[PDB]
Design a binder for this molecule. Structure first.
Ligand SMILES: COc1c(N2CCN[C@@H](C)C2)c(F)cc2c(=O)c(C(=O)O)cn(C3CC3)c12
Ligand SMILES: COc1c(N2CCN[C@@H](C)C2)c(F)cc2c(=O)c(C(=O)O)cn(C3CC3)c12
Ligand SMILES: [Mg+2]
Ligand SMILES: [Mg+2]
Ligand SMILES: [Mg+2]
Ligand SMILES: [Mg+2]
Lengths: 245, 487, 487, 247
DNA sequence: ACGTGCATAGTCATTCATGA
DNA sequence: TCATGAATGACTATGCACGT
């Protein structure tokens, strides 16, 4: 068990449960989303750490400069674990680290920067499956009489729309289907019922299979060598759609 | 270089500042209860079409439109004012329908302009009802490019309903919010008893407006302060939150606070208790835990020691925290461009007067427009009776001016009416279409007589205010939230 | 809970980000030389009517309109982008007419959004010329509420004229600005010699585009870097400011810098000299004084010591300050959704291709619309020829549908034409108006013949681009600012 | 008497002049960062310095002295003027013999003026007595004639006059662009500020005079003091006749 | 001394590629 | 290390009146 704040980051909205095994840390993109998350969370088991701006690339940046970064310090301090050789998983204050970013490309980018921080400084967190990715909603179907439905893809949107119409439900063509362009646009209720309610949230657990292969990929994509990254993108972007086919 | 004395400069400049702040910034107009920033935001959104019948527009658009046309000030503080009008814990009857993160009753700030969307609420639509029918005076904006309303129709008593707080120069206002249904009863009485004097009117209205009704629910303790505010324009109203004692399996007791008095920051409230316990001020308290959530609302759990009495700790909380705190009522509003402290009957009466003005002006506008339509229709009917000649005339005319000038002489008609004949489509020459013109004339002439009748009968005017308001209250009125108890 | 491998996640996410930045953020479209934010700002202002034929609108309104409809991002950085497009030292041909404080070439920041107004410039109006005549593909915006243009008509070669700088992922662009008149000659040659191969075209275009033309004037030293940039798509162009030696009366020689190379901050430049004289590494300098003003422009006076040679100090300034600095040209642009390094002949050709597309599409749209009106006019003429009959028929109809159906039978007419006859006003039955309908039909049929001719002859299409562009250059073209000198 | 100007121990916001002679030097105290920015550009850097003040100035009449001296904006003014305050006031160390207060023509500019004048009268009174304090009158309108040079107006009356004269003279204005209305210094560019408030051959300055010191002391205390009632009754009493002070 | 609400925005830190 | 330019906003301090 570990004490919760009521010596940690000022931005951290800690949970109430003193058991790390039961605790969760939502690492959130933006002050707005973090604000809404802090309200819609279950304050018993869920803590919120809002991150502001693009995270520093630990692959490119010098070590000392990374340690001066306020956002990195917030993560390292909140997780309770050390870094590199001074890493001690025993001091992990949350056994669930959920990264929650916008569905847009900049959210994807922030994910890669966080995953790079985690893989380089705190790898065991990934290896032991403590790192997760929350999948935010993209659409909210607002039926005239029925309860509203959330969709996490264009396909699901079309499906839920089709099903509802077939079921005799109706939507306004004005209000209609609200499209989310980021977590910052959501209120507390919406975030709870789509990303934080454990009975409905869509989390993805980050697994690490080939460490050596991962090491190389991280260095290529995140490293200082532009040429390697340039050729990699031109080589593999053409086939990004077919990774899971 | 011209010389100017410091006394002249100081006096002139500071008075200019004080007066505009008083009349044109910090204090509400008695008729609609709005400050200039409020009025200009709402009208901007209204004119922009950001209405409940369409999806929320990005709130940046409401701010920018307000800035560009009506309110020559900063986008930041304008956004703040818009945000406030959308918070259910700030306004008893929100005028802005906000979509997104608009903050909390605690220290959680609202999201930035970029993240939020906004539109007018249905009640705000009643603030602006028929504003386009010359129901209120308009004046040129800050650069004369466009017109803005001096006051809104305000088809519900917004000042009393949503209240107002403002710091001016030499004075300040602090009007609490009230229950719409109770205010309606007061208005209904004022309309029926339109001849009743101030003494009777105050008694009647005070009987119907039982006291302020805060959006945060809670409690009002006592009746004197409420009575003082309505009779004097000044009064101290004691508020309380609601506390419910819970027992534990071990047999430990805990206090659960689920409501707080109006304008008490939830986070500051918790911090204050924390800072007083650890400091050794509120003994008997064992533990403070905020079990609040978006689903259970406010829920502050105060576990107390075994050697502690629940009411003793509760009384200590009343004494040393804002769990019990007083609302300093000061009924200050602008009346005819002048700041005035008002009795409750004066607030109701001035509002009723505004409504009657709106209804008479609306009627006047409709009557004028009805006559214009009737005037043109009469012209068209004359053309139809001599349609063979009218068409032959226009055809044989070398120009349209010759055709027009001829029409004036042919049918003994105005130039406006003659122009309408010319603008008439061949569609309207069909049998049934000719008939609609006739019936429309008959239709309008009936409407004109109705309108003339309304203007001639103060009884009907009052009846309209009553009926229209009643419809609004039936539709948008809600239960009382703040409970009133005795000492 | 679904499992995902870190390599899969990393590769997909980073590639998705890189591709969007590359194609949809940092790099210019070759056809109009615009990044998405630019295009969306300009179209927002355009659609909002913020044009030169109207007073400057508050810039907040342009930002909010861009943000609310097209660009789902923050108000701050959008305003930055709008501001930059209005600065004469940033854009060689400004696309935004700014009113107020938009900053300076030094460290003086622009005024905040609230203080400034903005509208489109006449040239920006040429970017958007006839965009409403289906001259460019439109797509739904970020939420499908409205349509936005994929590219602008760009009736002058904007990419080369205003240049572009952008940091993407895996690559970056740095295209310098050019003199519009020189670019026009290049285009004129490309149009005349439309069959010329790349080798000839590159030679011809390089002869007419003598080199970059920076809004900050200054000097270009040498020709190799310019040639490399046009032949390779990459090249290092040596820039210099302008220095004028002045001799005082007491025998005190001083260097007067009146121009600086492109993208050199005036204040940073002065600071750099000062700090290297603090740190003695520019001996010979006696005193540094910034005599700049809004009325004389840039004027930095560098008084040098008596035992110092002016030319020695100037070379020292060339070496150790940005008085001489190189422009790293990298001619990267998006071509058909793909990033590509382009020769100067490719940049011109791709632009000419775009212009021809625009003119052909415009002509097609006009031809379609011409046919529609002609189609309706043919109906009207039939009605006029049998005018006596038309009226009698409409009269006897119980509805307008019976009247219409009859008109079809009477004159052998479409449903569209008969409807147009029905919508016709009695105004047009006057003599001159009947004649006007006749002549209008004759006019359109003449226009249709012209339009058909254009589509059938590539010669005319090229001629249209030439003549229209020439008109633009004659009106909005200016002298060269950057002087080109040899080693 | 001469003093060094900052060039690459004075406020960071201060854009000092080049002339080391206070007799020839001027300090423009400007409302807002935007206006201060434009002034810095349109000024004559030889004799004119700019000190932008941000936000409403602290009321030295109400706030205790220690709090006033901790205020960054007051510190900027005191430091820039070079003189001390109260008993340690030494006019010999005055860095500018012209202290021009330039605020928006709007109501909030008037308020900032009274706050600055209150600071000056209470902390550095001799600056007022010796005529070193001035008030810049910003333009309200800019008439943009189609063919002729643009004209500036400092009142509604002057606008009407210049409009009438020009039209009578055969000049013409567009009904769209037309007459630009200034709502604050922040809306102006560098050139406009020079040609209306900073060009010594065209600027409209008012020199603050101090006749009755005791009367001034009383007025300052009533308007700016902690006593609300006194201020309320003063305003209600004299606001009715503010228009007729110069009739 | 703190809350209130309408008034009077610059500063702060990263990604990303390239050349000094 | 710095500039470039579109991308990812909270914090900071006064006026003003009034009540704990
Ligand atoms: C809070 O993050 C930001 C920062 N900083 C503040 C200090 N901590 C760093 C991590 C981020 C900034 F120094 C500028 C901006 C901006 O300029 C800006 C903008 O919209 O222009 C947006 N953001 C935040 C993350 C989106 C910014
Ligand atoms: C620069 O002055 C301001 C300040 N501060 C910043 C620190 N120094 C103090 C003197 C003023 C502030 F802490 C907030 C605001 C604001 O919140 C604001 C707004 O538009 O809401 C405007 N301004 C400036 C003067 C107009 C503000
Ligand atoms: Mg986002
Ligand atoms: Mg603010
Ligand atoms: Mg920014
Ligand atoms: Mg102002």
């Amino acid at each position: 068990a570990l004490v919760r704040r009521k010596g940690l980051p000022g931005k951290l909205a800690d949970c109430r449960s003193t058991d790390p095994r039961k605790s969760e840390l939502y690492v959130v993109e933006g002050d707005s989303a973090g604000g809404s998350a802090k309200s819609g969370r279950d304050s018993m088991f869920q803590a919120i750490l809002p991150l502001r701006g693009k995270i520093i690339n630990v692959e490119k940046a010098r070590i000392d400069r990374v340690l001066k970064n306020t956002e990195v310090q917030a993560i390292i301090t909140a997780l309770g674990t050390g870094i590199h050789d001074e890493f001690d998983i025993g001091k992990l204050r949350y056994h669930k680290i959920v990264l929650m970013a916008d569905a847009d490309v900049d959210g994807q980018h922030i994910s890669t920067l966080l995953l790079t921080l985690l893989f380089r400084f705190m790898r065991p967190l990934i290896e032991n499956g403590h790192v997760f990715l929350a999948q935010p909603p993209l659409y909210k179907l607002k039926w005239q009489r029925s309860d509203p439905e959330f969709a996490y893809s264009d396909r699901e949107r079309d499906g839920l729309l089709e099903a509802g119409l077939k079921a005799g439900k109706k939507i306004n063509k004005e209000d209609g289907i609200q499209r989310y362009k980021g977590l910052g646009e959501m209120d507390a209720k919406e975030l709870w019922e789509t990303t934080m309610d454990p009975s409905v949230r869509v989390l993805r657990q980050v697994t690490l299979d080939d460490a050596a292969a991962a090491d190389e990929l991280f260095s290529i994509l995140m490293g200082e060598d532009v040429d390697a990254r340039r050729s990699f993108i031109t080589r593999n972007a053409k086939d990004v759609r077919f990774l899971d086919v | 270089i011209e010389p100017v004395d410091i006394e002249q400069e100081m006096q002139r400049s500071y008075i200019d500042y004080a007066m505009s702040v008083i009349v044109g910034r910090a204090l509400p107009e008695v008729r609609d209860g709005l400050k200039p920033v409020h009025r200009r935001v709402l009208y901007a959104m209204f004119d922009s079409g950001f209405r409940p019948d369409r999806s929320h527009a990005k709130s940046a658009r409401s701010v920018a439109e307000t800035m560009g046309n009506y309110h020559p000030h900063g986008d930041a503080s304008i956004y703040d004012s818009l945000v406030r009008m959308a918070q259910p814990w700030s306004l008893r009857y929100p005028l802005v329908d906000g979509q997104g993160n608009f903050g909390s009753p605690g220290n959680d700030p609202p999201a930035a302009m970029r993240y939020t969307e906004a539109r007018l609420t249905p009640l705000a639509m009643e603030m602006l009802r028929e504003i386009d029918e010359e129901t209120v005076d308009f004046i040129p904006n800050y650069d004369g490019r466009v017109q803005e309303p001096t006051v809104l129709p305000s088809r519900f008593p917004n000042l009393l309903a949503n209240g107002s707080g403002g710091i001016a120069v030499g004075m300040a206002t602090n009007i609490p919010p009230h229950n719409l249904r109770e205010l309606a009863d007061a208005v209904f009485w004022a309309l029926e008893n339109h001849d009743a004097d101030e003494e009777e009117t105050l008694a009647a209205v005070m009987g119907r407006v039982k006291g302020p009704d805060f959006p945060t629910a809670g409690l009002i303790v006592g009746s004197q302060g409420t009575a003082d505010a309505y009779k004097t324009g000044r009064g101290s109203i004691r508020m309380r939150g609601v506390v419910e004692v819970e027992e534990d399996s071990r047999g430990r007791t805990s206090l659960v606070i689920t409501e707080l008095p109006y304008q008490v920051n939830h986070d500051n409230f918790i911090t204050s208790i924390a800072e007083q316990v650890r400091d050794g001020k509120l003994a008997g308290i064992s533990n403070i835990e905020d079990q609040s959530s978006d689903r259970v609302g406010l829920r502050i759990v105060i576990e107390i020691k075994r050697d502690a009495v629940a009411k003793v700790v509760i009384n200590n909380l009343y004494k040393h925290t804002q769990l019990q705190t007083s609302f300093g009522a000061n009924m200050l509003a602008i009346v005819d461009g002048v700041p005035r402290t008002l009795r409750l009957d004066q607030l109701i009466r001035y509002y009723v007067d505004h409504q009657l003005d709106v209804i008479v002006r609306r009627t006047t506008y409709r009557l004028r427009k009805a006559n214009e339509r009737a005037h043109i229709l009469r012209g068209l009917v004359k053309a139809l009776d001599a349609l063979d000649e009218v068409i032959a005339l226009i055809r044989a005319s070398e120009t349209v001016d010759i055709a027009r000038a001829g029409l004036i002489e042919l049918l003994d008609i105005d130039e406006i009416q003659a122009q309408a004949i010319l603008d008439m489509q061949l569609r309207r020459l069909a049998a049934l279409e000719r008939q609609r013109i006739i019936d429309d004339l008959a239709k309008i002439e009936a409407e004109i007589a109705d309108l003339e009748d309304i203007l001639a009968k103060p009884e009907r005017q009052r009846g309209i205010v009553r009926d229209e308001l009643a419809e609004i209250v039936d539709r948008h009125g809600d239960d009382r939230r703040t409970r009133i108890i005795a000492i």
